[PDB]
Amino acid sequence: IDHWQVDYTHYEDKIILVWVETNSGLIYAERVKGETGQEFRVQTMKWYAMFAPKSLQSDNGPAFVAESTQLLMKYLGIEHTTGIPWNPQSQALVERTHQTLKNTLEKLIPMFNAFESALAGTLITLNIKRKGGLGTSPMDIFIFNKEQQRIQQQSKSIRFCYYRTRKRGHPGEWQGPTQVLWGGDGAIVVKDRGTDRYLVIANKDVKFIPPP
Amino acid sequence: IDHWQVDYTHYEDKIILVWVETNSGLIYAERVKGETGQEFRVQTMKWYAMFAPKSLQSDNGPAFVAESTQLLMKYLGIEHTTGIPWNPQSQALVERTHQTLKNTLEKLIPMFNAFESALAGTLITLNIKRKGGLGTSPMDIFIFNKEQQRIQQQSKSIRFCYYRTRKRGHPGEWQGPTQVLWGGDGAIVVKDRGTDRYLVIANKDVKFIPPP
Numbered sequence: 001i002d003h004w005q006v007d008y009t010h011y012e013d014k015i016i017l018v019w020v021e022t023n024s025g026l027i028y029a030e031r032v033k034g035e036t037g038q039e040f041r042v043q044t045m046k047w048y049a050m051f052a053p054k055s056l057q058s059d060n061g062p063a064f065v066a067e068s069t070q071l072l073m074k075y076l077g078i079e080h081t082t083g084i085p086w087n088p089q090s091q092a093l094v095e096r097t098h099q100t101l102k103n104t105l106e107k108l109i110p111m112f113n114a115f116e117s118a119l120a121g122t123l124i125t126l127n128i129k130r131k132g133g134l135g136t137s138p139m140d141i142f143i144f145n146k147e148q149q150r151i152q153q154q155s156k157s158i159r160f161c162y163y164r165t166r167k168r169g170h171p172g173e174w175q176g177p178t179q180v181l182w183g184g185d186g187a188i189v190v191k192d193r194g195t196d197r198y199l200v201i202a203n204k205d206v207k208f209i210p211p212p
Numbered sequence: 213i214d215h216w217q218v219d220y221t222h223y224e225d226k227i228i229l230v231w232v233e234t235n236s237g238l239i240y241a242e243r244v245k246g247e248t249g250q251e252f253r254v255q256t257m258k259w260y261a262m263f264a265p266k267s268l269q270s271d272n273g274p275a276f277v278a279e280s281t282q283l284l285m286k287y288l289g290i291e292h293t294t295g296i297p298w299n300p301q302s303q304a305l306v307e308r309t310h311q312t313l314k315n316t317l318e319k320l321i322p323m324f325n326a327f328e329s330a331l332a333g334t335l336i337t338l339n340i341k342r343k344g345g346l347g348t349s350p351m352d353i354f355i356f357n358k359e360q361q362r363i364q365q366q367s368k369s370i371r372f373c374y375y376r377t378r379k380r381g382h383p384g385e386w387q388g389p390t391q392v393l394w395g396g397d398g399a400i401v402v403k404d405r406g407t408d409r410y411l412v413i414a415n416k417d418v419k420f421i422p423p424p
Contacts, residue, residue: 023416038325038326041329042326042328042329042332045328045329045332045333045336046328046332048332048336049332049333049335049336049339049340050262052340052351088383089383089416089417113250114250114254116254116257116258117253117254117257120254120257120258120260120261121257121261123261124257124260124261127261128261128264132415132420133371133373133392133395133418133420134395134400134415134420136362139264140362141398141415143355143358143359143362144359144362144397144398145398146355147355147356147359150348150352150355150356159345161345171300171301180345183345183346185356186353186356186357188346203344203346203353204235204301205301206345208344208345208346
């Protein structure tokens, strides 16, 4: 679904916190100063802001089992299970992913001035550049999985707005208010009182009016 | 499309590099030590790794016009235009976005120990939590825009593999090789030689065999 595993990793004299998403192989990594629970909670916020995860697995390291970490996971709606379970599919993918990261970091370090740049370039190579058997990257798969979840709840489920049209690429005067006849994916349909014809407007040319 | 604007921002005695995507309102921010071109190129790598952008607008600040920055933008395939153009839709969205960030950061600072956590919590609030007129967040819109571009080139466009089935949630022995009859979105179709029936396998239960 949106399940992740987190580990502390060592590279020469540096400590790297490594997150791996067990469905798409997406990777997220960042250099840290130590293994304290406070810095792990800082990294936890940056991780959630980027990916909106749902569940997490880790070993029972101190930063992971601290009471403040457990309360933070619950506060963000994350089901965090300490102790790695038995799963051949995810365990094999995590192992390959960790090995490829170290090998790629070895090549990209001499290209850049900063270790942070080499690590960022490594994420680019693994998440964006390499394509699987179907020609999709890990980030292509992660995004596709996100959009599938949104269609799920949206399909299982009166507005008014201002709108404007564009002639030769330039937006016009705001018009309305008028009823939103149909809300679509990035577009709405309204009926123009002036010309008495139906129109389609994009989201960036619509200002919705808030319910009561 | 995937167009962004970048600015340096001041908050008390801190410097924040702020990126805003002009189609979805998505925001990315990070505290920096100064305004040098070297640190800006470091931040540029982290930004590209996360969002895979295409175009960028900024003013003609020194970190933005340096020769190494221009070559880096070209190296990553980014059309970078120094000097902000005239565009009412994007200029109004950037202004609102910057004001909301400062107001939200003011509230979340006393909740956290670290300024980095308050900034990360601010990104959560703006990108994930708040919903527009159609009930979609800025991150919902950003992702939806990504998946639309992938369907575009994929629709405008012989494989073999190993595969395995799952009974009660557990994966079975690897089987094959066999021809990929149809590659779908997260699934393939193969014909089982043993039972002589068609099957559907998910991507994580497929090991593709590389072309020559």
